């Protein structure tokens, strides 16, 4: 289809430019002008909830597309993986996991 | 379709390259995001969508967040790491590399020696793959949740400070 | 129009990488690099291979592998990070002690 | 396929340690309770294991394109669930003196009993390669659980990366032979190939990689090297489960993949399996000849236990009593190697802090711990295949199942194999009668398991048929 | 001459060679983990190798 493949040269020429555009606003920067502790492992906790969170989130976006198909056992198998995400959000926030203060 | 997965294929290995063989970890997580953000654009040559979709945002959005945060809490200076350069001796890779060199010769003689109608590219969609993964995969699903309740079990376990 | 044996040689080339990676390499950080190369080109193995026969399969093993990848990352740095706090350094071949 | 209610009755041990981890959970997230907890977590595995019976009278069937469930996956869902009942029973005491936390614990063994379920009824790449990290990843956790203690973080970080390396390994396989095969169903993993040409390059290179993964999982021979060490390294309940439940659940999948697989019964996959088999047992059985440490000469028997185990293996496709010999064989290694590492848990409880060891010291065992002494030297005799226990039965089975198939190179290996290990177990054996320089019933009630699991190895390895026929009752899909 | 009972020396050298072979075998477990991964490559190419050979 010519549609499509129209689609497909505007989506390239979107992102050349607006690299090039960028590039060229840091090379123009540069060229004009005259010249003259310890981190805490909540850090590492908190993005690691995340990546967790993250992965049973795409689970949720691949049922959130095709739900109709799946019909109301999708659901019951759907309402089981976030009744098991939520009793982990439960048991985080309770132990004090995602409690920034101590 | 063919001449964006040649290209991102090379790119992807050509990044890996870099990553297996740099000091700076910071420099060597980068080319590891490059590196994945070709094997999502191999991904979408091949009409799986949804993988690219989850390669970029979850992969490369997500687990290397994670590395690169970790290697802020350590503050990681090259410390005995780039002033020994152990690995870019030859006394060091000559071994593994040949080891898996060999192993991807027979891997890759296994590999032509197989049926091979081509690739369509015809685009799988996120719908059927939600389709199948609350379908047939329903207890994939499940002990998939099981399992990353595991990991974050261990993990805040091990990872505390205290 | 893509070969099915192209793409399960470059999940093949990226496989050694990352093995070779995980060898040649004493820093607990870079072997768990190595790892994520690993488990990734085996993903894209079996994207590759799903592709080709035209199913979800392949697809949903991507999923199954990166969920896997993803914990997987999470133990792996929690472990280096205690190694960090416990031993100030993260050189695996310090970490030895049993043997024989 | 869709799920019926019957499909739920199938499903039953699974829901029911699913919904036991569910509700520990909410159980510490309500109030930390180490007494609650356990408790909780035993009477969900009780509840799954007494729920094995109404999922016999649902009968055997499909359920998932990724389940079946019959007698074989009865038997493992058993032998697992026992395996993490004993491992919580010998946990409690060595949590006792742990000042961190205490019921994530429960938590982890929960979860990988989960796993070992799965792989019981794997009938599905997708299913074996999931049940595998679920019981590995909690496993990774469990090993390393005393993380302040230095070898116990060793053995965390070497399990870790070595389990992430056999798992990249075996999903690299497991593409490769869906590329060849286009099914993921182990009963199409080579069915289309005919005419003889069932050896095709491809398939098998798959089926090399996976064999890889889990001859890492197996501590099969050349991927056996982590076993001492991880052994070790790990808190003692720990390494319990993970001799018994790991090992068996991955043994019974790998059983029921080379069943079912029309490339199974491939000529060089049986010659490959065979030189695993037969380096297994000698490698096992001669690097334990010269251990001081009890731990590490257990892992060394698991190597070459698992020898003979894949000995029986190899025989499936000839053979009709290969898989009853894997059972018989694997109930009396689960009550021996139950035994055996819950003495050493039991005498390792309570855990004494980080910094001080926790070395075993067995010699003169019987002058102040006499019932545990006897009950060890009924496991060492049983390891090493003596009559009047259970592990002869199995040794015999093995050997029976070698001679029917003519192989005798690997029935070769299990005599010389079966010489070594008499010599390393005797010595351990009579270590704990020369002379040498509690009081909680959760204490009691670990003494009475590691009693009771003596008393079973006695009686059945000289009475034996009635675990036989419970074995040959179990019967998977033709 | 046979006071020192040579047969049951010729039937302890099984003993001895199985001492040798275990003491030889367990240089192999020298606690790195590198080895370790060394050792699984090892055995993939061994497996892999065999598998194309007996086809
Ligand atoms: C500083 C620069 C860093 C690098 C930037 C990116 C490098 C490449 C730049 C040149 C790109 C050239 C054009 C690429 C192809 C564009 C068209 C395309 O993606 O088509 C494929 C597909 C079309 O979908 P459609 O046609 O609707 O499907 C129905 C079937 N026909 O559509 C899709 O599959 C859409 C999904 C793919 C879209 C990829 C967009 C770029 C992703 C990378 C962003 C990087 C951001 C900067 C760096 C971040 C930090 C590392
Ligand atoms: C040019 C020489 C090299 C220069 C340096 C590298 C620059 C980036 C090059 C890689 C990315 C762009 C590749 C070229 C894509 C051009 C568009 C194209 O080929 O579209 C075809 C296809 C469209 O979809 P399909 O429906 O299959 O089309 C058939 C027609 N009906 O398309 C597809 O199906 C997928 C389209 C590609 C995937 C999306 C974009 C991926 C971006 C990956 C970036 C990786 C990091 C790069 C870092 C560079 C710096 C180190
Ligand atoms: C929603 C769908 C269905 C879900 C499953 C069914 C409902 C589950 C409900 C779970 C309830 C959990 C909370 C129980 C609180 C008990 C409080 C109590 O009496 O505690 C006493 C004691 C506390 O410990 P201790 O240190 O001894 O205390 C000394 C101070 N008195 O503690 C004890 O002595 C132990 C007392 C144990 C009491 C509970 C025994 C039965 C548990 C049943 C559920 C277990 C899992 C089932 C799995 C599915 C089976 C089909
Ligand atoms: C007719 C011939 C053909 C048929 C043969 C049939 C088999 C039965 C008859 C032959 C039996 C031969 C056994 C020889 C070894 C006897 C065991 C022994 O000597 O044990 C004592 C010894 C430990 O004592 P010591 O020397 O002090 O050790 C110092 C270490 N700190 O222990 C050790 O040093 C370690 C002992 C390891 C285990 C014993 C050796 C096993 C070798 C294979 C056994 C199976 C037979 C295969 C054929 C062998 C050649 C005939
Ligand atoms: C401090 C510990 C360091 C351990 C480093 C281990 C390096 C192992 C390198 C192995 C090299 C093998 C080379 C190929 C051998 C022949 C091909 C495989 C066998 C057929
Ligand atoms: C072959 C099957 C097992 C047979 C029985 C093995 C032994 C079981 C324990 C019985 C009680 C042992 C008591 C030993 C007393 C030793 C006293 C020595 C004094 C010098
Ligand atoms: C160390 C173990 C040695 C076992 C030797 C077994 C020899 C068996 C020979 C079988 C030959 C069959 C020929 C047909």
Redesign the pocket.
Known sequence: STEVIAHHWAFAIFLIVAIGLCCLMLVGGWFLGGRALRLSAKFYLVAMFFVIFDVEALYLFAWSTSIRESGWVGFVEAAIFIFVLLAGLVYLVRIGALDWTP | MEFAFYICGLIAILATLRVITHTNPVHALLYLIISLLAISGVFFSLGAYFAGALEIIVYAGAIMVLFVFVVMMLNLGGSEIEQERQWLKPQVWIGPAILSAIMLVVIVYAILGVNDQGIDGTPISAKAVGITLFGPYVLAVELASMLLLAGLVVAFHVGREE | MIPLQHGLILAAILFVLGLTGLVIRRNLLFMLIGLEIMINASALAFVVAGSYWGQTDGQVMYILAISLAAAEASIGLALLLQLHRRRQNLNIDSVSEMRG | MTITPQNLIALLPLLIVGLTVVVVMLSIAWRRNHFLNATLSVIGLNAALVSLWFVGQAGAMDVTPLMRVDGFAMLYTGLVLLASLATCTFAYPWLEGYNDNKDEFYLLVLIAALGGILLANANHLASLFLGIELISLPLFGLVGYAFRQKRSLEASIKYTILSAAASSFLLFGMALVYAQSGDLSFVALGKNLGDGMLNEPLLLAGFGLMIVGLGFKLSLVPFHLWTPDVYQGAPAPVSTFLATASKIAIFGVVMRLFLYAPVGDSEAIRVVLAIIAFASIIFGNLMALSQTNIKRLLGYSSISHLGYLLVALIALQTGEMSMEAVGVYLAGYLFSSLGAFGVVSLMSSPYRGPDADSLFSYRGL?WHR?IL???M??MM??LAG????LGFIGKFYVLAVGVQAHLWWLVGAVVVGSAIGLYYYLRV?VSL?LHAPPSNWQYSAGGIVVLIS?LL??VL?VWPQPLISIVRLAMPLM | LLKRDPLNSMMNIPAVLSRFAGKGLLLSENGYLRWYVASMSIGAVVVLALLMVLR
């Not at chain 4, 003596?386 to 226990?389: A, L, V």
């Open positions: 019987f006499p002494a006897a009950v030297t009924v005799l049983s003596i009559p009047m226990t054996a009668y003596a190895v006695l390895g």
